[PDB]
């Protein structure tokens, strides 16, 4: 489906040789991006604004400067912002082009991704280039450069294997799987790719990356979540224990309780703990698999409905 | 804290007799509410608008402060969610309050203003959150009805069962119109404690303005999974991308069963080792990313 974009890499090969850990770069004529449905509605800045009934993110030294200390803004007032140096991000663009939504969903299935995985489109736009510093995300991306050139640094992440959080060149959960020392800010010793119109970059989860640019760019970014097994399993375990009213009862700050009544609670918890262990022990792979439509990314979830409501 | 507000009712009483399951109604002079830090800049609809620098919810769509007053006349109700942003004075007070309520530290908590007129509000539903409500202007009609279908619900539900809820549902639901239910006419200086689970609806004949303090209701199930998660997340077998089996070849799915049987066992084992201190220590987790996200989304709109 995508296979017109990445041709001559097959898809079989994309899934065996590349996804979900090694980036793939695919050069070609920008024209061939038309095989995506809705692509026309996103080929230029003006096309996007024509369609984007939602608040637009604006990012720039021109905001620090017009706030003496990043924000949202009406689409009407957005070209004004762009013409003053300042990057625009149009999140959840798929909301306004149903055809690309239909596609992304087909893509989702092709990537054998869990059905409840988050998926959105975003367009980035900046008149005097820009970029961002070294960091890794927990999402995976297709990036389609439509206009301009952006220069990308890419670097295998040797510190963490399958990260579940964004990080910038450590949070309480990363320290638990971080190993070794980080790479230098300039990502020296990193693969350097310059994305030009018609270039598609598949950006796997966790790959260190930074960008520099000094030309007007326009890019369609497609973002998927990477739900881990942990996620489905806890969901499944949650399905199991949720009917037991004991597990529903309002939890309580330990610190609050007195000495005496605390002890009494350790008895109750220990016993809940037994039931959670018995229930875990009887988890089947089906039960895990059937939890594949749960929300694994409430943070994208809330953002999606909120933008629906602002529409 | 609010001994003041609900006097003659004691805090000892309120926690023993009412929270977290029995509604309470407490009447008196609205000057009592004068003590809620920032009550002044919320005492009227005009005030609320002067400070409320965000999109107002109309009932459901979101809307400018400007477009909102038009939907008021048209009888839609106005939710000024996350008002605490605009009077952060209140946030101290509330933070003391969840302390005294003995709620887990990472329990969600916001202020909301509601205002309605002619004559609208909210059809019958119950919430997984709990609220103090404070009547400031006007008279709001409330129907109330003991939930006899579910004990400690984990989601909202309106008269219409989802998957999770259907697991714990019992019996016949109430009538749509909520007969067999206590009506209650909340007037200025009235406070109502609305416990989680209780069926309720609102209607405002004339103009009403009410301040509302929502707290989340984190279950043990929540703290336990949080805690189970801290244990397991360091093991990389658990961070691997999941798949949708429906996709895979019969061979490839088998290979996945085995892979999973081996996680399941490690999971059973780490769950066998969970202490209660591990659970009490996850009390600061975030049990409601939904709210926390709205809070920041709204911040960016200010
Ligand atoms: Fe990124
Ligand atoms: Fe409600």
Swiss-Prot record, chain A:
Domain JmjC, residue spans: 86-241
GO molecular function, one term: metal ion binding
Co-factor binding details: Binds 1 Fe(2+) ion per subunit.
Binding site for Fe cation: 135, 137, 209
Entry keyword set: Iron, Metal-binding
Keyword rRNA processing in annotation: no
Keyword Hydrolase set for record: no
Pfam families recorded: JmjC_2 (PF08007)
Cofactor(s) of this protein: Fe(2+)
InterPro entries: JmjC_dom, NO66-like
Sequence similarity: Belongs to the ROX family.
Protein name (Swiss-Prot/TrEMBL): Uncharacterized protein YxbC
Underlying gene: yxbC
UniProtKB/Swiss-Prot annotation, chain B:
Chain sites annotated for binding Fe cation: 125, 127, 200
A Pfam family matched in the record: JmjC_2
Boundaries of every JmjC domain copy: 76-232
Gene3D superfamilies: 6.10.280.40, Cupin
Cofactor(s), by name: Fe(2+)
Keywords annotated in UniProt: Iron, Metal-binding
Chain ranges passing through the membrane: none
Listed GO MF terms: metal ion binding
PROSITE patterns, sorted: JMJC
SMART domains assigned: JmjC (SM00558)
Cited InterPro entries: JmjC_dom, NO66-like
Record text on cofactor binding: Binds 1 Fe(2+) ion per subunit.
Parts forming coiled coils: none
Family: Belongs to the ROX family.
Protein name: Uncharacterized protein YxbC
Origin organism lineage: Bacteria, Bacillati, Bacillota, Bacilli, Bacillales
